[PDB]
Each structure stands twice: as structure tokens, then as C-alpha cells.
């Protein structure tokens, strides 16, 4: 990939930005741009390509075979009891979080037992992230 | 990929923006642009392509064979009991959250037992994310 | 990859930006730009390519065979009990967080038992991240 950008506030090719309480006076601005972009990208020129898979089983004897793909999750436990007991008392809770297995982004690609792949594969994340703000 | 951008506030090719309480006077702005973009992208030129899969089973004996794909989840347990007991007391809760297995974006592509693939695959995420904000 | 940039605030090719309480007077700005970009990227020129897979089982005897892919999670336990006991007392909680297995970005590509791959694979992450902010 090409030209992958995170810009926090402002993007220009040419900028003349005049901001705050300023005097901007008698200004002559002249601009003469030639800006051409030529892309030959992710391009393929092939006579033959072959993706061949063969399984042969002859006079074989097969017992108790297990094939298990990735991210097998077995007998996982989360135990998060919360207890408040009060007498003659005050609780003030502000912005209190209990957070279990919270996800923002999950991107999964070609997650398999078996893969035969030819060509291009791509993942991009661009992000402003804030979990907690309070005040 | 090409030209993948995250811009926080403003994007322009040429910008003459004037913001606040400013004086802009007698200004002469002149602009002459040539800006051409030429794209030959993800182009394919192929004479032959073959995706062959063959399974042959002769006088074989097969018993107890298990093929399990990815992300298999078994007997997972979440226990999150919340208990509040109060007498002659005061509870003030503001912005209190209990969050279990919360997802924003889940993208899954080519998640399989077996795969034969030729070409292009792509995942893009662009995001402004705030989980909690309070005051 | 090419031209992957993280810019915290402002991006320009040319900038004439005027900020705060300034006097900008009689300025003559003249600009002549020639800026052409030529990209021949991720380009392929091949006569033959072969992805061949063959499995042959003869007069063989197979028993108790287990094949397990990556990220296998078994009997994981999270125990996070929170207990507050109060009598004749005051509790003030501000911005209190309990966070268990919280994920932002999860990018997974080609996670497999077996893989045959030809070509390009790419992962890009650009991020402004704040977990907690409070006052």
C-alpha cells in the first residue's frame, strides 16, 4: 500500500490560513501548480498459475484423528462479584467502571485450518481512541 | 491500497480560511492548478489460472475423525453478581457502568476450515472512539 | 509500503499560515510548483507459479492423532472479587476502574494450522490512544 496517513487536525496541499485577532493586509498571493500522480499499483501479469491440492487415502486404517483450528477457547471462567455493604454511611461513586472482555476493533483475515493463497492481503486501522474521560 | 487518510478536523487541496476577529483587506489571491491522477490499480492480465481440489478414498477404514474450524468456544462462564446492602445510609452513583463482552467492530473474512484463494483481500477501519465521557 | 505518516497536528506541502494577534502586511507570496509522482508498486510479472499440496496415505495404521492450531486457550480463570464494607463512614470514588481483558485493536492475518502463500501481506496501525483522563 501507499500514502497511509493519520493527521491530528488539519491537512492541505497549500495553506494560507489566517487564525485569530490578526491583521492581514495588502497581501498578494499567487500560485502555479502542476501536481500529477501516476499509479501502476498491486498489478499482475501472469501466463499460468496453479493452486493444486490432492488427498489420496489407500487401504489405510484411521482411528481417533482430531484436527482443531486456531482460537479454540475451552472452559474459561470470569468471576467478578461486587459487594457493597453500608450502615450509617455514605457512598459517592462517580465514573466507576467494571469492564470485562470489552473489544474495540477485531479484524480477522484468512484464519483457518489450511490455506492456499496467491496475491495481496491487507489490514489498516486509523484511530483516535479514548476509553475514559470524566471531570 | 492507496491514499488511506484519517484527518481529525479539516482537509483541503488549497485553503484560504480566515478564522476569528481578524481583518483581511486588499488581498489578491490567484491560483492556477493542473492536478491529474492516473490509476492502474489491482489490474490482472492472466492466460490460465487453476484452482484444483481432489480427495480420493480407496478401500480405507475411517473411524472417529473430527475436523473443528477456528474460534471454537466451549463451556465459557461469566459470573458478575452485583450486591448493594444499605441501612441508615446514602448511595450516589453517577456514570457507573458494568460491561461484559461488549464489541464495537468485528470484521471476519475467509474464516474457514480450508480455503483456496487467488486475488485481493482488504480490511480498513477508520474511527473516532470514545467509550465513556461524563461530568 | 510507501509514505506511511503520523502527523500530530498539521500537514501541508507549502504553508503561509498566520497565527495570533500578529500584523501581516505588504507580503508578496509567489509560488511555482512542479511535483509529479510515479508509482510502480507491488507489481508482478511471472510466467508460471505453482502452489502444489499432496498427501498420500498407503496401507498405514493411524491412531490417536491430534493437530491443534495456535492460540489454544484452556481452563483460564479470572477471579476479581471487590468487597466494600462500611459502617459510620464515608467513601468517595472518582474515576475508579476495574478492567479485565480489555482490547483496543486486534488484527489477525494468516493464523492457521498450515499455509501456502505467494504475494504481499500488510498490517498498518496509526493511533492516538488515551486510556484514562480525569480531573
Written account of the structure:
The structure holds 3 chains of a larger assembly. Chain A has no helices and 17 strands. Chain A is mainly β and 135 residues long. Chain A is flat. Chain B binds chain C through residues 6, 60, 70, 89, 125, and chain C through 57, 69, 86, 105, 111, 126. Strand 13 (82-87) of chain A pairs parallel with strand 13 (82-87) of chain C. Chains A, B, C: Belongs to the TMEM106 family. Chains A, B, C: Residues 1-135 are lumenal. Chains A, B, C: It comes from Homo sapiens.
Assembly context of the chains:
3 chains of a larger assembly
**What is the makeup of the main sheet of chain A?**
none
Helix content of chain A: under 10%
SSE order of chain A, one letter for each helix or strand? EEEEEEEEEEEEEEEEE
Shape of chain A: flat
Classification by helices and strands of chain A: mainly beta
How large is the share of residues in beta strands of chain A? over 45%
Largest interface, per-chain counts?
A: A-B, 135 and 135 residues
Overall number of strands of chain A = 17
State the helix count of chain A. Answer: 0
Tell me the Rg of chain A in angstroms.
30 Å
Q: Separation of termini of chain A?
A: 41 Å
Keywords (chains A, B, C): Amyotrophic lateral sclerosis, Cell membrane, Disease variant, Disulfide bond, Endosome, Glycoprotein, Leukodystrophy, Lipoprotein, Lysosome, Membrane, Myristate, Neurodegeneration, Phosphoprotein, Signal-anchor, Transmembrane, Transmembrane helix, Transport
Subcellular location (chains A, B, C): Late endosome membrane; Lysosome membrane; Cell membrane
GO molecular function (chains A, B, C): ATPase binding
Family (chains A, B, C): Belongs to the TMEM106 family.
